Design a binder for this molecule. Sequence first.
Ligand SMILES: C/C=C(\Oc1cccc(C(=O)O)c1O)C(=O)O
Lengths: 505, 505, 505, 505
Amino acid sequence: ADLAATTSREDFRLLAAEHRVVPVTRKVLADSETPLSAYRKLAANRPGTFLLESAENGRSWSRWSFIGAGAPTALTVREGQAVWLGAVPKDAPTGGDPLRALQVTLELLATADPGLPPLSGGMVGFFAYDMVRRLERLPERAVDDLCLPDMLLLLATDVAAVDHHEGTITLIANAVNWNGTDERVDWAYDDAVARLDVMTAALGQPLPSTVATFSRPEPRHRAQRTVEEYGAIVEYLVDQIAAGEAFQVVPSQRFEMDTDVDPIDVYRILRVTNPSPYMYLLQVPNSDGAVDFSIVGSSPEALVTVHEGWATTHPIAGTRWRGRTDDEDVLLEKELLADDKERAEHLMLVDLGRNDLGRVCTPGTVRVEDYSHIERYSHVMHLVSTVTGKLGEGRTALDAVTACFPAGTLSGAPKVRAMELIEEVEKTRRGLYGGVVGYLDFAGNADFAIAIRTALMRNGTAYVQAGGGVVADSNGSYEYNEARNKARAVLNAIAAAETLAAPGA
Amino acid sequence: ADLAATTSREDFRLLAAEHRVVPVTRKVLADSETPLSAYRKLAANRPGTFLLESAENGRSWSRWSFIGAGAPTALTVREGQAVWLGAVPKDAPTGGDPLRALQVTLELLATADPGLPPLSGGMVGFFAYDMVRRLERLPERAVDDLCLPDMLLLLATDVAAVDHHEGTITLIANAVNWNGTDERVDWAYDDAVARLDVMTAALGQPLPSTVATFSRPEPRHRAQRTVEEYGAIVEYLVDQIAAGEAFQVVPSQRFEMDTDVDPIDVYRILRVTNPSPYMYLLQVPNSDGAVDFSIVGSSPEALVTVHEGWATTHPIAGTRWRGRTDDEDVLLEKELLADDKERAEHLMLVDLGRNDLGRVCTPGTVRVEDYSHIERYSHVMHLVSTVTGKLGEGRTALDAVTACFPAGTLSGAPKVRAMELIEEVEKTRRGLYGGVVGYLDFAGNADFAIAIRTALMRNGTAYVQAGGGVVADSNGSYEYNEARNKARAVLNAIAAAETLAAPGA
Amino acid sequence: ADLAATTSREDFRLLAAEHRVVPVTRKVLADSETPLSAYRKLAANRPGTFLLESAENGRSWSRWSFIGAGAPTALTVREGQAVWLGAVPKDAPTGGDPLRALQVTLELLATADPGLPPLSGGMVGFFAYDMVRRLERLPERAVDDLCLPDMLLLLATDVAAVDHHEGTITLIANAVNWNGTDERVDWAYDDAVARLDVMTAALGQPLPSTVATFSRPEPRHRAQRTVEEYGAIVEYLVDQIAAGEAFQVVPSQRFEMDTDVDPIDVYRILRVTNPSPYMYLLQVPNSDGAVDFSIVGSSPEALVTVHEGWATTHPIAGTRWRGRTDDEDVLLEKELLADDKERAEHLMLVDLGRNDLGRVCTPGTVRVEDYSHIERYSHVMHLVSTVTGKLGEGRTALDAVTACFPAGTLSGAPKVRAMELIEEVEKTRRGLYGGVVGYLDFAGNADFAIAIRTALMRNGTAYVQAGGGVVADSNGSYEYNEARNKARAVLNAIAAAETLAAPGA
Amino acid sequence: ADLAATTSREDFRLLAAEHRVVPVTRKVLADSETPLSAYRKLAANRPGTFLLESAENGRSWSRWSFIGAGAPTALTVREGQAVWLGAVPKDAPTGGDPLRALQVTLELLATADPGLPPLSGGMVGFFAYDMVRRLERLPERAVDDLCLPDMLLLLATDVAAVDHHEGTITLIANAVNWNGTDERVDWAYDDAVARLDVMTAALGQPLPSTVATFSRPEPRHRAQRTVEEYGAIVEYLVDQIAAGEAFQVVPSQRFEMDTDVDPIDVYRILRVTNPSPYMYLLQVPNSDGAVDFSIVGSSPEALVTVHEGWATTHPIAGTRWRGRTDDEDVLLEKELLADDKERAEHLMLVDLGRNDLGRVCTPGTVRVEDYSHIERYSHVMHLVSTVTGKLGEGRTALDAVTACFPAGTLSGAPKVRAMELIEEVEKTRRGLYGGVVGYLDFAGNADFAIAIRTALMRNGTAYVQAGGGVVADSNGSYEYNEARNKARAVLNAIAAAETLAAPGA
Ligand SMILES: C/C=C(\Oc1cccc(C(=O)O)c1O)C(=O)O
């Protein structure tokens, strides 16, 4: 038996009888490729491509990265209605409510549940924060500057799963049989095999070096708010909270830079400087099939993850700077744990998570574990917990996402009142900020990162929005600066990425 | 400040005043390189090059890999005397006892102790098992078939340390000032900078793909012993042990294949099939400076590791197959822990380690920890402990190595009597088998793997030797088969490596 | 300084200025007394006396036991109104709502918060299950056979705290200054000192032996329900639950024996046979000041405990028999943990506890810890968790008790619907069964046990009521038998206690 | 079946056929007795009686205490020869080496190995430190002031085991059949039953109160050494150690008080003030059968414990005062753990224990566990480890004791050189100091405490000897004071015990 043995026609036939999506796979040895080099080869920065990587706690890359090698097709929204970009067949849900359209698409395109990597195919993309407008009634005071759709999800059928442990890549070409009929079976197989052959040959190409140097210039950028305007918004919210309007609210503002630097170069600097449990680079296509814009992020927190029937969330709140150093690091931990206020803030969000999940999980299954423990990241440590529940009968991964959306850590507690306050105090619509980036795979799983520490790159401009939680005793300047600094991590990376050069050049 | 900023001449001068070795370094971003691809670029399978990688427990690659980019020069042994291959200056110790020669070389070439990767430069290579002949009196019954020198250590001055976490490579060109005088300082700097520039440009080159497929054919190979001859040697040793000659002894035999496959290709298959905490590929040069032979291994166990004054060992003994699966896996662990015999065998080796270290560590510092706990590897689990001691005043990393040499896990308990028995029952001299591969870095640290699960590749022939511990109740056939199977892991990898082809070719 | 130094008049004066209750204490060495022997000496089975002991997990007695040495006075209820038995002064709250009467009594008689044992004085007694009728509207179908008051709490001012670790007894005579005025200070001191002197001299007396033997005869007793009647009640409740009326409900029935055996003798057999974290013996006085009845119990579970501002509960649900033995014991634990149904039942009660406490604790302080872990008791093991919260501003220990009352483990989930169902299916009012026995100390703390595994002993009759949780898949006979057996533990103890004799007599 | 059911004649007969010692037992309920009260009743301070109690870490009394109710007979030493006090039959080993005499006695009187408490019968008493003179050659410079025998062990055949958990006492009358013949079986039974009946009736008696008060006067006492003499001995030993004569040595001196206070009263004050894992009170008889002297102690450390074939030791070294308080307590622990010197001292003693046990345990069974962890006692914390080994084939509990004797913690490392130094610097023979008190039970187990924090009380005088470990950097005054203070704990207790009075008397 050969390593790169492709799925047999015989086996594909059997699978095609059972489900409307059949992955056809081929594993190769790729010990001289990294996720990035493989992306370069397989995707080449093309519209509808992506790379997803993961460094738990910003320390140690996990086993898998996933590359999208060209999705001709994406489900999105235009003038409040669900529409596909690129061509799909007659049976693909279109028009109307986009969430319902997405719900039916996922009901139709489920697969078996084998051996496959965690993500081998599915709907991959984002939900804007402003998708929440369709789940909760909110005022419409802030202006929609960026004009992004509520969602856009690639139908990602050609996927390369890079296994860092084995040094292998598993190539997947999924046959999508929308109409569910017996017809075209053998055609579907050969088509899938041909897409495998394309990815394979792309992997067969040589590559020039990107071995490089860069410096870290301070970026020049535009802010929506001065220290004064921001500090006063914070004081307003501190007043609301003291009165009992909410326990906590997460205001933000937008910053911007003009730049023509490739998105991947920004990804490269983020990966080196702020590795995180959710790294992503996504080229979002337009109706014409060129790149409308690019999303580059390194996010520290998932909204939700769904796996084998269970939805899980990881509320994160409470911060100290990592120690400079080792004795100081432990003082700081004992201090965060002893900070009763922050303990309380964290617990509020843990309860909010319990409730969110309560909406779609079977009663008596929603539990908290590893409650309020410490996690170290590259530059800071936090309190963290796990909330996990069994998806209720007939509930879906998408129900888990909508039930949790948006993260309490990006809105507040209680959530609606906090969103309301956010809308009162913020100049523009958030767009992707506080939304999610992630996937819904055909087997029923899902993983979404909160869209923070992220740049959206459009027509010569890069937007980076950042914020931070406000509580009873928050100080306006302190919050302004903490927020700006979060943003500068990304802005700094863009400025760095612009200096990328071959060493001694 | 630029990422690839090279060490300044000004700083080098100061360092040169203080020590006879001064590393000159340059860090680059190399997010599209793997250790293997970097090796290909920097070393290109040349004589005197190496790659060292590490996967703890065969699961999760550690942060660092180290590439040797061409050592013009190596300390070894010819006709019982210490000699350099390639050219060294007048002050480099030569002739006589090779251990003393190595001892003085290390005393001379120490560095400061900064920021550097774990290995940034030093003496890198092997000690044959038969080096033990110079530390203990042994009979000379077995024939020296392979004729390897007791040691050979590259003077590895051009090193690339690959950081998987940051995606960076730190290039080091060490200036070796043997004579210790003030002269040539500025020349030394420019020379080091030029070696950096060579490695840099080598990294700047493109590379063809090695994306590949392979199959796993059963190899045809030669064995020194039949099941009958081997089973009877085991029964002999079981008799000695029952009488109280020793508690345990580790006999082995040699297997061989003819093959012309590149060594790196064998490394590639080992890396995929049997990842381990010590992977190595080493091209050992001759006096002419071509490759005399190649060592390729994936070893599960260190002899000793020395770091910031402390020597540490990790005795490993007791085995079960990993579970097939998860419930079975736990039964097996409860079983190994409950196996009083194997507990005893493990404890014997732990005590042997305590004593070995007692020879060179300050009294009242040699401790055992994490005693006799379980570790899972890809295919098996073992009992494992830690023995660690403070190196006694005026003792060196090399004293730690010789004090421990050879591993009890490859000889037995008590060690000399076991070696004696090994010599009575084995046909040929072990050569590298049961020796070590590793390094002694200029800062005083050291890390050596036991040389097992290793192929030595010379003039169209690949040698793989394997064995296993014999105790009171060992069965001859069982031990024959367990030993042969250990060997076949490597032999299988050579046969696989021969099928390596571009997919669909 | 003498060990038995009594509090000084000078110090009492200062304390009397600050609070309406001033404990006057004297510590003695009592290394030849047990809690029982001390009780015999100090209380002698008199009306208004009690003994409280604690064996955590039924294994290892805790440090403290507490003896009440004659409370002349108790707050209780007659014809729905709050009344004192024995004489109290004009300022002591009487008439009306008994809970309000108890609330004001505790507000009045608070102390400082020193050095004192956990309980040094306070209101000590019970709340009937049927006290719940004043916090929730319930139907009145079942007949009130036993006619107990909703509550009765001794004003326990003479207390002996027995310290098993030191072998000492700390005697406390609390001066209760209801009117709050400066008058009678020096009189109060001498009175307290005289009560100390009485307890002291009582401790000074000799004692006859109770060294003893006993056998374990099967008791003859009366049951309210046959296996058929009980099994059918269980099936009824299983039907309600399947329909979604509740998740769980805890029906019980009453058993009875005629006996004239002293209550302490029953306590003695319980202590030997079913030691528990809450042992109690209480002699409840009547208006005439003789014993109306006696309560003897060994309870496995607290309702709530309040200490230094925090209320804590320990939901317990999920059972296996302890192992017979040690390998079997671990199988059983792995099994209980793996029992998803019982996990769910336990989680329901944990959530119910979170909510109960939510009613009186500051938001963002009610947390779960040590979630759903195993505890071993003498004969069974359970799942157990901790729910703890900060009492909200201006909330009291009594608010914690009422907020939790009655235990979900004795009612069900959700609680009211379960109580409703209990009332539909049960013949008589529960009385003390499912109520609590415990104390509210003057410093603000509280500890109450659920009143189960308890005998109420009145006019030649002993009542023991027992029950068990019903869920979706409960079997009628199994529940009948499990319930009866719980009861027989107490009934067996009464029958044993009747055989108590000096050995060979 | 009755609780106090005595062993049947039928069962005794069967047992008598199998072993020369047959315990005849009767369990009673004794919930109004403490170990002390039971001792008073059963032993009444008579010669040849004892009480043994245990408080692990000086916190929480363990389950069992053991009372010896009159041993008519003891194996001891007079003019270097083994002799019995009181009458024994012809077959009882006498004359000669006392250790051999004790060895054969134990070989003869073994029992089965059931249900019994940990100690139900055996040889109970002490070994003097100076017993070591028969296992190692030592100089004879110091004068033998106290003139104690090398050993004296009661043949303790009437034992009461007090179970604090159950509140029960298990009475044991062991039938000792020295001659091993069939004769007198039925006589032996009735005799044992009569001894049970005596203990039973003694338990049946009443008792007066000992409820009491006491003060803590500073005792006036005699010391062998001034601060100057002691500080200079310490400096001498510091010099020897610096030169490498030993790593550590434990000098001591003797203190004395005249007092006529009962020994039990001293025990009572020790029990309250310095509870420990080994409490003992022993009345040592003379040849006339009156009390020769009394031993009262509270020891923190076992020499060795032997149980079901395994010998175990618990080396203790490294000290801090407990924290005053809770934050300070943790600083102190982090500090002791970080004290590399004390770590080393502790490790030396751990190794010494490994070796001691190596002399009598099967190779490959002697292990260390729970290495060098912290234990809190009432006033101090220490580092502590466990060393445990399997007794070698044909080795006995007594071999374990002699192999370990005396504790390294009371001698030093290496042990002989330390003893030698002790003998050079100490005025008198140690006697019991640094010896052991404990038992060897008939089933093969053993438990011995190091004889420290102990008073020996003879003819109106109480001796208390104390010392402490000397190392490289010890200070003379500091050690003098630490030693004196250890002694004063006992001396203070004697002075306290003299004030014992009924409260207000
Ligand atoms: C590291 C632990 C083991 O591996 C070996 C022990 C001894 C010899 C060998 C060998 O490969 O020759 C080996 O793999 C083992 O099988 O116990």
